[PDB]
């Protein structure tokens, strides 16, 4: 599925293994250890 990845997109986040400084871990994208970072 891509639903969670797409929702990261819709939320203006980025799917990352680790969130960058200043970014909040607001969800997960699809895939393994793909975190939605905003």
Numbering used by the authors: 1 to 38
Per the authors:
Defensins, a family of cysteine-rich cationic host defence peptides, are a major component of the innate immune systems of all plant and animal species, however crocodilian defensins are poorly characterised. We now report the functional and structural characterisation of Crocodylus porosus β-defensin 13 (CpoBD13). We now show that the saltwater crocodile defensin CpoBD13 harbors potent antifungal activity that is mediated by a pH-dependent membrane-targeting action. CpoBD13 binds the phospholipid phosphatidic acid (PA) to form a large helical oligomeric complex, with specific histidine residues mediating PA binding.
To understand the structural basis of CpoBD13 activity, we determined its atomic structure using X-ray crystallography. A single copy of CpoBD13 was found in the asymmetric unit, with clear and continuous density observed for the entire protein chain. CpoBD13 adopts a fold comprising the family-defining structural elements observed in mammalian β-defensins comprising a single α-helix and a three-stranded β-sheet, which are connected via three disulphide bonds. A Dali analysis of CpoBD13 revealed that human β-defensin-2 (HBD-2) is the closest structural homologue in the Protein Data Bank (PDB), with a rmsd of 0.8 Å (Z-score 6.2) over 40 Cα atoms, and a peptide sequence identity of 26% (only I26 and K38 are conserved in addition to the cysteine residues that form the structurally critical disulphide bonds). An overlay of the two defensin structures revealed that residue H35 of CpoBD13 was located in the same position as the key lipid binding residue K36 in HBD-2. We surmised that if the activity of CpoBD13 is as conserved with HBD-2 as its tertiary structure, the co-localisation of these amino acids could indicate that histidine may play a role in CpoBD13–lipid interactions. Our findings reveal that despite limited primary sequence identity, the three-dimensional structure of CpoBD13 bears a striking resemblance to HBD-2, suggesting strong evolutionary conservation of the β-defensin structure between humans and reptiles.
